[PDB]
Design a protein around this nucleic acid. Sequence first.
RNA 1: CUCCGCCGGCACCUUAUGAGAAAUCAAAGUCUUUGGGUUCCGGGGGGAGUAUGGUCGCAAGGCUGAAACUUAAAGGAAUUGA
Lengths: 95, 76, 202, 119, 128, 214, 70
Amino acid sequence: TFKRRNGGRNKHGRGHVKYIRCSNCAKCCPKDKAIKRFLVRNIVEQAAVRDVQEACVHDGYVLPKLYAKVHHCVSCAIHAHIVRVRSRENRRNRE
Amino acid sequence: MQNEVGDMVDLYVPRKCSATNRIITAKDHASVQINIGHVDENGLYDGRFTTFALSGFVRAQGDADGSLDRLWQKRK
Amino acid sequence: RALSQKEQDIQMMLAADVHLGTKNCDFQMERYAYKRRSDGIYIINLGKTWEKLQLAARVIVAIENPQDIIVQSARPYGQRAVLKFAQHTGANAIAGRHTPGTFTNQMQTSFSEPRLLILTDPRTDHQPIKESALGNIPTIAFCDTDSPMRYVDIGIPANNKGRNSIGCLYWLLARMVLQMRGTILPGHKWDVMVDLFFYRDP
Amino acid sequence: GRVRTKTVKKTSRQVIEKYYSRMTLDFHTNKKVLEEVSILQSKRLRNKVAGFTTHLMRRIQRGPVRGISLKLQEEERERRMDFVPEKSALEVDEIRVDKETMDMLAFLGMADLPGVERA
Amino acid sequence: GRRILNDALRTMVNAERRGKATAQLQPISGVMISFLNIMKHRGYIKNFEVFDPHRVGKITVELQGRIKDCKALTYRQDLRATEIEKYRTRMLPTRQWGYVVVTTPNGVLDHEEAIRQNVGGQVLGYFH
Amino acid sequence: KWVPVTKLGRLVKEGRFTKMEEIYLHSLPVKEHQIVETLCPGLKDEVMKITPVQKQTRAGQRTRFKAFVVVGDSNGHVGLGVKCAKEVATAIRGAIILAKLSIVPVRRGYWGNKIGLPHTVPCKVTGKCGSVTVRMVPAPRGSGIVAARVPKKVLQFAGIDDVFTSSRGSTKTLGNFVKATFDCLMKTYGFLTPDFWRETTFTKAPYQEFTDIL
Amino acid sequence: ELEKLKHKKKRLVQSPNSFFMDVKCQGCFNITTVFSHSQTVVVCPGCQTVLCQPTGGKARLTEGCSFRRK
RNA sequence: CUCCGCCGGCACCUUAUGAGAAAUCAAAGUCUUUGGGUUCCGGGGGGAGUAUGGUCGCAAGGCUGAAACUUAAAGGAAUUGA
Ligand SMILES: [Mg+2]
Ligand SMILES: [Mg+2]
Ligand SMILES: [Mg+2]
Ligand SMILES: [Mg+2]
Ligand SMILES: [Mg+2]
Ligand SMILES: [Mg+2]
Ligand SMILES: [Zn+2]
């Protein structure tokens, strides 16, 4: 019983994909099988933006954003609810 | 068909698709029998029409429109 | 001199926004889409549209009993068009949404054995098309240039996504059915005016 | 937990279809109206129905409404549905089309066509 | 590689089972033309136009949709004029129609002609 | 009594057909079983297999019995009806109704000499359903019906007198096996033969011929 | 027609897409013939000038070189 | 960078008119209406990739590879439930 056309990963034209480390557990999963999100998160949340912009020394300053690109494996993704088991039909769309 | 005596033994010699010439079975419910009326002159109709048979195969292909077009380019 | 009925009616269809198809085309009806404006949008050969309009008119007028014909639209642009088409041609319009089984479910309250089915959009009315495919129901459909023409016998290549197009198309089929049945005597004077067909939005 | 069931709702639709000008908005009138235009076997169902037809009246008395079929409003919505201008609005003295459209006309032999202008 | 008389027969089968009107065959042969002649002579396809510009060649046949199947028995057997008769049952839909096309020293020709002329040959194919 | 609900059923109730040939020729869907009862009167009914299927619920397993019935006359009209219901009585009734709603034609042929009435099938023909497949090869007159018990009980109803059968796939599933034999028989008028080549002059459909009565 | 669109060897009769063109430069009013897909540089015999540059398709002409297909 | 078109890639999306045990497949299609060519390989589940014999390897190993006896199921796809 085959569950996915691409196998769960998107490798076509290759035979080998260099692997990466899960950010949670450090399981080794190939780069193009790993649930990759690029999250860009403010240093603070919106209860802590004015209390730092009324304490920034120089007026007109803008907060940075944590740009980082986290990698996860399938186990840590399912466990963290980054992704969910979708129905047989709904499983097929990519948006 | 014709027996060697003179009789004809089969039942309802079937009709054929006019686009594919495949014969239309007795359970091909996707088959149509169009009727195109003839215009003559003032009045532009009389009970005189040409008839076409289209099979389920032809319709499901999507060329059933093209078949009617290129068959109703027939002149008399 | 004068002008032919071709000429009047093609002026009608140009001004009524019927030459402008969609962004793309389907192989089953690139035999109509004439060229491309650099937008990418295609333009339909109205000569072939009008030839298929006669073809559809003949196919309609070949029915002995006009009460035995169904015309339908699921688009919210064509309800007025189809209702008036029925009130003028003696058809039996079924506007709005189609109850699955109107054609095959012999013990449904809404039952109908059309000798012919007319569909404003082969896309939206994809339910009646398939249903006809079970009941031997020839089908005349207004195929826009992105139409699945599967199970479509007589497909008029004609834009059907503007406020004017569907009304215009049904006014042309209306007049040609009436002319062929002779109910309006020769002479291009037909006393029913076009803006009746275009829908009135409350 | 006060959702009216199908019996209540469809008696509501049927009675307010079948009798419009003989009901009002004031609740307590409707009770007795329905007592004389219907036969029921539970005064609590009777009040349950009246309490729903009263705001069905409230919604109809302002605007339009679902299934029920009423003659004073169908007739007017047909009176103004059969409306056409003094003169047909799609007017053809000036059609402005584009080059490939005129190419279609050239293909069709209607090279000069009254009122068709180069955009 | 190629074993044409197959490139062609399966092309006509595909085209006719679909319902096309004109099919084109990229290689030609004396066997191709003499085969199509047997089909046409027995009344299964209409005429066909052989584009012989200057190369291997090319054919375009104009089908009537009245053929139902045609096949090449590559692995061209040998065939005496007595086991004409246990192929005609082996390959064909019945004892009435359908023809087996056997190359014989009197040119490419079908099996009833072969029996009448009392020759054997090697089966090229068949059609029905 | 009947109360017809399809216009074809009407055209039959006031009795302006005679035989099922005009309906078959025009490929119409028969939706009321009492049509065929009056069009083909010498029709024979027969149930062969009653097999119980089971769906399993929270409480336990609820069984439905499904019936495989064949109805037909020995002159080329055969029909197969399969219907699953709680009681064997209603299973059989439903299956006989579906059988008479699925009547098809059987054309026969001759082996080599077209003398007398037709006996076998015209040509080599294939019926496939699921994994079971059946061939019917013409057989010389007086060769009996050589086939499994199920296709023999289809064919002695369908009217074929002689035929040669070779079968593939799990024939032990009687459902697919009888549905495959019936598939093989229904498509015998699917076969484009030199004798059908003469172009067919059409006939007005029932709906277009008898329009005034509508 | 589309048979200028259809592939070179998939046309009904196989035909080349190339041509021979007569180029006249400026520095020497003589005429020199070149092949559309040149594959080598060409120098006008008189004025010695360069006329084309070989590339992956047709040649690239030098400035002011009037060519006539022929 | 935009539009169009040819080849040649890895793919991808809708659909049966196709196939199949089906999941599914536009190639796993053109097969009981069975043949384009070619190579390798399977014949219930175990025993068993084991014993032995050979042979390559320093070694682990690799390549080739049975029988006795055991057994009525092992397995595939999908459906309802739990
Ligand atoms: Mg590669
Ligand atoms: Mg690998
Ligand atoms: Mg490409
Ligand atoms: Mg074994
Ligand atoms: Mg396994
Ligand atoms: Mg399993
Ligand atoms: Zn992890």
